[PDB]
Amino acid sequence: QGGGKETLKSINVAIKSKIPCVVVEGSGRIADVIASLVSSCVKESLLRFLPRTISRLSEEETESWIKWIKEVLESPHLLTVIKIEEAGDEIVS
Amino acid sequence: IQFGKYIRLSCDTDSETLYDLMTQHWHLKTPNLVISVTGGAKNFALKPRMRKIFSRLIYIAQSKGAWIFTGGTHYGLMKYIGEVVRDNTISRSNVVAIGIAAWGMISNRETLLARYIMDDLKRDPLYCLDNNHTHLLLTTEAKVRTQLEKYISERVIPESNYGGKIPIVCFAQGGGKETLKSINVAIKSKIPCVVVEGSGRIADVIASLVSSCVKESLLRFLPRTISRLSEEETESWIKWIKEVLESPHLLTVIKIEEAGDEIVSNAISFALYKAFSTNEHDRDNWNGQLKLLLEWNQLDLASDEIFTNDRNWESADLQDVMFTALVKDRPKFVRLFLENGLNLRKFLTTEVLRELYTNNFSSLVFKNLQIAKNSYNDALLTFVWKMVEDFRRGRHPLQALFIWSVLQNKKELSKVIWEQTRGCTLAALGASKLLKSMAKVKNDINAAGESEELANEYETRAVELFTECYSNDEDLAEQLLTYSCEAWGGSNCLELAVEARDQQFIAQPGVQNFLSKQWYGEISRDTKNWKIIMCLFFFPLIGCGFISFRFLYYVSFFTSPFVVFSWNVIFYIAFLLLFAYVLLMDFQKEPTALEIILYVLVFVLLCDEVRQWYMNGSKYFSDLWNVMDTLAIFYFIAGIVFRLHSDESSWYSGRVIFCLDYIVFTLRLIHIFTVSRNLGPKIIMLQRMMIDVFFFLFLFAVWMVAFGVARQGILREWIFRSVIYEPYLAMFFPEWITIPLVCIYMLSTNILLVNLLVAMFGYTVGNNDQVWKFQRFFLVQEYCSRLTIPFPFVIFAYIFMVNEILAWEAVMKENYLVKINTKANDSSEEMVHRFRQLDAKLSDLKGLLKEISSKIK
Amino acid sequence: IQFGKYIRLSCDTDSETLYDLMTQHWHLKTPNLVISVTGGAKNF
Numbered sequence: 003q004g005g006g007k008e009t010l011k012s013i014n015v016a017i018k019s020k021i022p023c024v025v026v027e028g029s030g031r032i033a034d035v036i037a038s039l040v041s042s043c044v045k046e047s048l049l050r051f052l053p054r055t056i057s058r059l060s061e062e063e064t065e066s067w068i069k070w071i072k073e074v075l076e077s078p079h080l081l082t083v084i085k086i087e088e089a090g091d092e093i094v095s
Numbered sequence: 096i097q098f099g100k101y102i103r104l105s106c107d108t109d110s111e112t113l114y115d116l117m118t119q120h121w122h123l124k125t126p127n128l129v130i131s132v133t134g135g136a137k138n139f140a141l142k143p144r145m146r147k148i149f150s151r152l153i154y155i156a157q158s159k160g161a162w163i164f165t166g167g168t169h170y171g172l173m174k175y176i177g178e179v180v181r182d183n184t185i186s187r188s189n190v191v192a193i194g195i196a197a198w199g200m201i202s203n204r205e206t207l208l209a210r211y212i213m214d215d216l217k218r219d220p221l222y223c224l225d226n227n228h229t230h231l232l233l234t235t236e237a238k239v240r241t242q243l244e245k246y247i248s249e250r251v252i253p254e255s256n257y258g259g260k261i262p263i264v265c266f267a268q269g270g271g272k273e274t275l276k277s278i279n280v281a282i283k284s285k286i287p288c289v290v291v292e293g294s295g296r297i298a299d300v301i302a303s304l305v306s307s308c309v310k311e312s313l314l315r316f317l318p319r320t321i322s323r324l325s326e327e328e329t330e331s332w333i334k335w336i337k338e339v340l341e342s343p344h345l346l347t348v349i350k351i352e353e354a355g356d357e358i359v360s361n362a363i364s365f366a367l368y369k370a371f372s373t374n375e376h377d378r379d380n381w382n383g384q385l386k387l388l389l390e391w392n393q394l395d396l397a398s399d400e401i402f403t404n405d406r407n408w409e410s411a412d413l414q415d416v417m418f419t420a421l422v423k424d425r426p427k428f429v430r431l432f433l434e435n436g437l438n439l440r441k442f443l444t445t446e447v448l449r450e451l452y453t454n455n456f457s458s459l460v461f462k463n464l465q466i467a468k469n470s471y472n473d474a475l476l477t478f479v480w481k482m483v484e485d486f487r488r489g490r491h492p493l494q495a496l497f498i499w500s501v502l503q504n505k506k507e508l509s510k511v512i513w514e515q516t517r518g519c520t521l522a523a524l525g526a527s528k529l530l531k532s533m534a535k536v537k538n539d540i541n542a543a544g545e546s547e548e549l550a551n552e553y554e555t556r557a558v559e560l561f562t563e564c565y566s567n568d569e570d571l572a573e574q575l576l577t578y579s580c581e582a583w584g585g586s587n588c589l590e591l592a593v594e595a596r597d598q599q600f601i602a603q604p605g606v607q608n609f610l611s612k613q614w615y616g617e618i619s620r621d622t623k624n625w626k627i628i629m630c631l632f633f634f635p636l637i638g639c640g641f642i643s644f645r646f647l648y649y650v651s652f653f654t655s656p657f658v659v660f661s662w663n664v665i666f667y668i669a670f671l672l673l674f675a676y677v678l679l680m681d682f683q684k685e686p687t688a689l690e691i692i693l694y695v696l697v698f699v700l701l702c703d704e705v706r707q708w709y710m711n712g713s714k715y716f717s718d719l720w721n722v723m724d725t726l727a728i729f730y731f732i733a734g735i736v737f738r739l740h741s742d743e744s745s746w747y748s749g750r751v752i753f754c755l756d757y758i759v760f761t762l763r764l765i766h767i768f769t770v771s772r773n774l775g776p777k778i779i780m781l782q783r784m785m786i787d788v789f790f791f792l793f794l795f796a797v798w799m800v801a802f803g804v805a806r807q808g809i810l811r812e813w814i815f816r817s818v819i820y821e822p823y824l825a826m827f828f829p830e831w832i833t834i835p836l837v838c839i840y841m842l843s844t845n846i847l848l849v850n851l852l853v854a855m856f857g858y859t860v861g862n863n864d865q866v867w868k869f870q871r872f873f874l875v876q877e878y879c880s881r882l883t884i885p886f887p888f889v890i891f892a893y894i895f896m897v898n899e900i901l902a903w904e905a906v907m908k909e910n911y912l913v914k915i916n917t918k919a920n921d922s923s924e925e926m927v928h929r930f931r932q933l934d935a936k937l938s939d940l941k942g943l944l945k946e947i948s949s950k951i952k
Numbered sequence: 953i954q955f956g957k958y959i960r961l962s963c964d965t966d967s968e969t970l971y972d973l974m975t976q977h978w979h980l981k982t983p984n985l986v987i988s989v990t991g992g993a994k995n996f
């Protein structure tokens with residue numbers, strides 16, 4: 003859950019090195035740009051949830067971020083979302 | 096002016112000292128300034144919805160201290176706006192309603208307390224001035240107004256809560272060219288924001304747009320307007336609406352779907368937020384947007400747009416933002432600042448607390464403390480009134496803030512700080528004890544009526560938290576009961592629930608099981624009753640495998656309060672059989688050695704009870720049967736000194752005093768039997784019926800005295816020995832007087848009979864499992880406090896006298912706080928979030944139907 | 953450590969006996985293993 007380059011990098015090394023599964027949530031910056039995707043329309047949703055992040059890191063680093071989200075949607079089975087609609091228990095289990 | 100101030104003006108007035116007229120020779124400045132635009136419309140559909148929107152607006156204007164610029168005429172809205180202003184000054188929740196009129200359109204004129212005539216509002220097109228506006232400045236009017244609002248929007252204040260900028264908002268509803276012109280001069284000259292509504296003509300043509308499709312909607316809401324004004328003026332109207340949609344951020348709509356409160360304060364604060372945000376000289380400023388969204392109650396806008404992890408605060412700068420979140424009573428924002436990080440113990444320094452009890456403690460509540468401390472005093476109130484006076488004359492800091500919120504009846508602010516306290520089932524009872532002391536103060540029924548319910552909310556919070564605590568570990572929750580609190584008030588949760596008469600905390604099965612653990616002592620329950628009694632008469636049955644104590648077994652048996660009480664009843668009967676054997680067979684002339692035994696057996700009955708003249712407070716003397724025990728022992732000792740007198744008239748009278756003392760020693764045994772059997776739901780029926788028969792026997796004795804005066808006055812210091820005694824011994828000429836004498840007895844009976852029947856039935860009138868279980872807990876607690884050692888060996892103890900649970904209770908609070916909110920899903924069962932969750936899904940269908948007509952045309 | 957265990961390590965550590973450190977001289981093995989990722993965000 004939540005944003006930052008470091009949590010978006012660690013989902014990649016989770017899915018792509020070997021293949022253990024990943025659970026994401028419905029609140030955060032990087033957590034919701036991968037929850038919205040379940041192109042540059044990646045970057046369209048990316049400045050929806052974290053617009054004040056793109057103003058600092060480079061465009062040669064903005065290209066890697068759209069690249070990074072491309073290697074988590076290659077394996078859509080290793081992604082489970084905890085949508086905000088589940089307003090109860092059972093939801094983590 | 097007298098139907099109020101007046102100033103004549105032409106349109107080209109001056110250079111900004113008109114505002115300095117309003118603030119130097121006149122009233123105070125402004126943290127807000129609403130303007131209203133409706134024109135001189137004599138017709139106004141004053142719906143009850145429109146009544147709420149423009150009564151909340153005047154309520155907001157006094158909640159912030161605003162001016163209201165309106166046309167100062169007596170028509171419709173601007174007449175109603177004046178009436179809510181005089182309603183607000185009458186209700187006294189001041190507000191300034193400055194009227195802006197033409198001076199060429201008014202009806203009458205008086206130039207110099209001027210008199211104005213509100214004669215009648217006929218067919219003459221001249222306008223009548225309004226009577227309820229506090230100030231009046233006199234379409235001639237729409238430049239001197241618009242230049243003033245274009246002055247004060249730029250007037251930089253040194254206070255500067257909204258970038259300085261004296262917050263302007265334009266409140267617009269209804270139709271006409273004049274209200275559509277004034278929105279333009281609002282948005283385009285300088286840029287103060289505009290709020291529109293969902294009812295009106297011009298109000299809805301701008302509410303529909305959030306081309307000639309402008310004119311399509313324009314004849315939807317005002318078709319009979321276009322038939323009069325020119326097409327060279329219809330072109331300007333579509334032009335005019337084009338300069339309000341160039342700035343779509345300075346427009347907030349009050350949609351008809353918002354069928355509740357918050358809606359005027361939501362719209363003004365959202366319009367003031369965009370004019371702060373879209374200025375962009377403030378988008379880097381997270382702090383000015385916070386205090387703006389905290390002065391108003393916009394919790395959701397502060398959570399979504401200030402705490403995002405895109406802005407980077409780091410929660411140590413949030414100190415003065417938290418102090419104003421406390422003193423303005425913003426309970427949702429003190430919760431938001433702790434959720435996003437704030438060490439509340441670090442923030443609460445001792446000079447912050449004395450800043451809170453001096454400046455921010457209300458003088459009315461502090462007045463009711465003196466009526467509470469001096470009139471209904473307790474051990475907690477003497478602590479708290481001292482604790483208030485220590486701060487006002489200038490360590491558990493989280494409970495100093497919690498007492499501050501609880502004293503002022505801040506209902507939702509105190510429940511935010513209660514979840515931060517360490518001993519929180521004790522702070523809930525300590526609040527319930529404190530608030531029930533303030534609810535005793537009859538200086539104000541409304542203040543005492545809400546401290547009474549806040550006490551019942553904190554008693555229920557202590558019930559549900561301890562039921563959570565007892566269900567997880569019994570042995571840990573019972574340590575939490577007797578926690579000596581490090582001077583919360585110097586009390587347990589168990590003491591503080593029984594001073595407060597907190598019957599719901601005491602009737603709960605965790606507390607009632609703790610007392611049954613206390614009364615059985617180290618002897619377990621589930622053994623049997625007769626299994627313990629047969630170990631009293633048989634000493635070696637304790638060491639046998641016969642009870643279940645969960646030598647050291649013998650001292651744990653004979654110090655349990657069940658055994659000590661059963662011994663003190665068995666020994667009391669053996670005292671009464673010895674007192675009957677001495678009084679009949681013995682008692683010759685000298686104090687026989689068996690009677691010397693009785694002289695020390697009442698002395699150990701005496702020293703046990705002057706021991707109960709400690710823990711005393713003169714509570715013991717209002718028990719109505721415990722005063723019989725001293726007067727049974729004092730009557731015994733008076734019967735001793737009449738034995739040692741050697742006179743046969745005094746020795747025999749010494750026996751008579753002993754024989755009459757045998758009954759009150761047996762009446763005490765009968766009283767012990769009647770309370771221990773009726774321990775159970777009849778202990779409320781008992782001891783209320785027992786004081787009811789003491790009143791009836793008092794009224795029977797008053798009648799028996801008056802029957803003696805009628806008896807002795809009919810017949811022939813002697814009177815006291817004959818007017819009192821002989822009427823009882825009598826229950827052991829006719830002139831015509833029987834015409835009232837049976838009517839004496841028909842009136843003597845029916846006032847003693849009714850008092851007897853009131854005694855049988857008066858327990859019924861005036862929860863009865865909680866009313867019982869408090870009293871069953873009350874009575875058993877004093878005996879467990881009454882020196883649990885066998886009676887003849889009480890003197891051998893009397894003359895011989897001469898925070899990991901708080902961490903455990905904290906984790907039980909978090910499990911309890913989740914169980915509140917996960918049970919508030921029946922509140923979320925409604926269609927509040929469920930309504931447009933799927934209208935969002937068809938707006939996605941609208942969002943993909945964007946794609947269809949993009950290329951068919 | 954006292955404010956708990958501590959081990960100093962550089963990044964190129966060893967061949968999998970770090971896990972065998974955790975299970976032979978140390979606690980029990982795992983029927984599950986959750987990992988959490990939020991970074992050093994001081995704001996949450």
Ligand SMILES: CC(C)CCC[C@@H](C)[C@H]1CC[C@H]2[C@@H]3CC=C4C[C@@H](OC(=O)CCC(=O)O)CC[C@]4(C)[C@H]3CC[C@]12C
Nearest residue numbers: 614624628657660661664665668669771772774871875
């Ligand atoms: C012929 C004489 C000398 C021997 C008869 C023995 C009784 C006079 C004694 C032994 C058993 C005693 C009883 C043992 C158990 C009962 C019920 C017991 O019930 C409770 O504990 C109250 C419940 C509560 O406190 O919650 C209170 C004491 C009492 C009345 C005692 C009253 C006097 C008793 C009957």
Ligand SMILES: FC(F)(F)c1ccccc1-c1cc(C(F)(F)F)c2[nH]c(C3=NOC4(CCCCC4)C3)nc2c1
Nearest residue numbers: 700704721724727763766767768770771772874875878
């Ligand atoms: F029994 C009882 F009420 F059902 C009872 C039931 C359960 C727990 C305690 C009691 C109880 C209550 C009181 C009282 F509430 F009244 F204080 C008692 N008082 C005595 C006395 N023993 O010696 C004295 C008698 C002879 C003269 C000197 C004093 C007093 N025993 C009590 C037991």
Ligand SMILES: CCCCCCCCCCC
Nearest residue numbers: 623624625626628629632
């Ligand atoms: C409520 C149980 C009462 C049992 C009384 C037993 C009396 C035992 C007397 C032994 C001499």
Ligand SMILES: CCCCCCCCCCC
Nearest residue numbers: 837839840841844848851
């Ligand atoms: C003077 C006698 C009047 C009639 C007395 C009857 C009263 C009965 C009371 C029974 C409780």
Ligand code: NA
Nearest residue numbers: 840843844847
């Ligand atoms: Na009578």
Ligand code: NA
Nearest residue numbers: 844847848851
């Ligand atoms: Na009678």
